[PDB]
Design a protein around this motif. Structure first.
Motif, PDB file in Angstrom:
ATOM      1  N   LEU A   1       2.214  -8.811   4.446  1.00  0.00           N
ATOM      2  CA  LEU A   1       1.963  -7.355   3.249  1.00  0.00           C
ATOM      3  C   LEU A   1       3.124  -6.946   2.043  1.00  0.00           C
ATOM      4  CD1 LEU A   1      -1.048  -8.800   4.823  1.00  0.00           C
ATOM      5  CD2 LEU A   1      -1.346  -6.099   4.306  1.00  0.00           C
ATOM      6  N   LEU A   2       4.149  -6.615   2.420  1.00  0.00           N
ATOM      7  CA  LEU A   2       5.169  -6.754   2.048  1.00  0.00           C
ATOM      8  C   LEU A   2       5.298  -6.470   0.162  1.00  0.00           C
ATOM      9  CD1 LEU A   2       7.726  -5.134   0.952  1.00  0.00           C
ATOM     10  CD2 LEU A   2       7.447  -5.114   3.092  1.00  0.00           C
ATOM     11  N   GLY A   3       4.748  -7.410  -0.142  1.00  0.00           N
ATOM     12  CA  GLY A   3       4.430  -7.789  -1.740  1.00  0.00           C
ATOM     13  C   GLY A   3       3.681  -6.355  -2.187  1.00  0.00           C
ATOM     14  N   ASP A   4       2.597  -6.674  -1.422  1.00  0.00           N
ATOM     15  CA  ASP A   4       0.860  -5.630  -1.522  1.00  0.00           C
ATOM     16  C   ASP A   4       1.673  -4.034  -1.669  1.00  0.00           C
ATOM     17  OD1 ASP A   4      -1.138  -3.748  -1.081  1.00  0.00           O
ATOM     18  OD2 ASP A   4      -2.140  -5.525  -1.445  1.00  0.00           O
ATOM     19  N   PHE A   5       2.776  -4.361  -0.242  1.00  0.00           N
ATOM     20  CA  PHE A   5       3.274  -2.368  -0.169  1.00  0.00           C
ATOM     21  C   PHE A   5       4.649  -2.679  -1.972  1.00  0.00           C
ATOM     22  CE2 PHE A   5       4.888   0.834   2.523  1.00  0.00           C
ATOM     23  CZ  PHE A   5       5.665   1.231   2.036  1.00  0.00           C
ATOM     24  N   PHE A   6       5.115  -2.881  -2.412  1.00  0.00           N
ATOM     25  CA  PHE A   6       5.684  -2.622  -3.729  1.00  0.00           C
ATOM     26  C   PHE A   6       5.519  -2.071  -4.495  1.00  0.00           C
ATOM     27  CE2 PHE A   6       9.443  -5.236  -1.818  1.00  0.00           C
ATOM     28  CZ  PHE A   6      10.506  -4.128  -2.447  1.00  0.00           C
ATOM     29  N   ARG A   7       3.461  -2.762  -4.608  1.00  0.00           N
ATOM     30  CA  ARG A   7       2.525  -2.407  -5.726  1.00  0.00           C
ATOM     31  C   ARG A   7       1.982  -1.262  -5.425  1.00  0.00           C
ATOM     32  NH1 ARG A   7       0.985  -4.605 -10.284  1.00  0.00           N
ATOM     33  NH2 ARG A   7      -0.508  -5.701  -9.742  1.00  0.00           N
ATOM     34  N   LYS A   8       1.924  -1.315  -3.696  1.00  0.00           N
ATOM     35  CA  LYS A   8       0.901  -0.166  -3.559  1.00  0.00           C
ATOM     36  C   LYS A   8       2.019   1.282  -4.020  1.00  0.00           C
ATOM     37  CE  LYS A   8      -0.245   0.701   0.248  1.00  0.00           C
ATOM     38  NZ  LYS A   8      -0.685   0.827   1.753  1.00  0.00           N
ATOM     39  N   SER A   9       3.636   1.545  -3.325  1.00  0.00           N
ATOM     40  CA  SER A   9       4.434   2.468  -3.204  1.00  0.00           C
ATOM     41  C   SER A   9       5.175   2.489  -4.842  1.00  0.00           C
ATOM     42  CB  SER A   9       5.432   1.700  -2.805  1.00  0.00           C
ATOM     43  OG  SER A   9       6.758   3.329  -2.810  1.00  0.00           O
ATOM     44  N   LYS A  10       4.627   1.375  -4.994  1.00  0.00           N
ATOM     45  CA  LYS A  10       5.156   2.014  -7.387  1.00  0.00           C
ATOM     46  C   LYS A  10       4.425   2.285  -7.672  1.00  0.00           C
ATOM     47  CE  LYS A  10       7.005  -1.429  -9.425  1.00  0.00           C
ATOM     48  NZ  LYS A  10       7.037  -0.207 -10.814  1.00  0.00           N
ATOM     49  N   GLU A  11       3.156   2.445  -7.384  1.00  0.00           N
ATOM     50  CA  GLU A  11       2.276   3.663  -8.419  1.00  0.00           C
ATOM     51  C   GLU A  11       2.596   5.142  -7.790  1.00  0.00           C
ATOM     52  OE1 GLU A  11      -1.682   2.908  -8.585  1.00  0.00           O
ATOM     53  OE2 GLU A  11      -1.810   2.083  -6.426  1.00  0.00           O
ATOM     54  N   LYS A  12       2.689   4.853  -6.511  1.00  0.00           N
ATOM     55  CA  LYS A  12       2.599   6.677  -5.307  1.00  0.00           C
ATOM     56  C   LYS A  12       4.128   7.281  -6.187  1.00  0.00           C
ATOM     57  CE  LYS A  12       0.905   7.309  -2.320  1.00  0.00           C
ATOM     58  NZ  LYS A  12      -0.711   6.768  -2.302  1.00  0.00           N
ATOM     59  N   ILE A  13       5.013   6.832  -6.338  1.00  0.00           N
ATOM     60  CA  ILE A  13       6.332   7.480  -7.421  1.00  0.00           C
ATOM     61  C   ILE A  13       5.613   7.738  -8.293  1.00  0.00           C
ATOM     62  CG2 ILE A  13       7.337   4.712  -6.601  1.00  0.00           C
ATOM     63  CD1 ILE A  13       8.443   5.204  -8.968  1.00  0.00           C
TER      64      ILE A  13
END
Length: 37
Positions: A1-13
């Motif tokens: 679920l790394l690809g999903d992480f990037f998407r999640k972390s993306k907005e987190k920033i």
């Protein structure tokens, strides 16, 4: 679920990054002892 992480972390920033840029903007204000005369 790394690809999903990037998407999640993306907005987190965007959320903290925004508050950061806003906060840092204030820092520079209380940084200089004397602004432009």
């Amino acid at each position: 679920l790394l690809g999903d992480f990037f998407r999640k972390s993306k907005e987190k920033i965007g959320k903290e990054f925004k508050r950061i840029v806003q906060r840092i903007k204030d820092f520079l204000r209380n940084l200089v002892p004397r602004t432009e005369s």
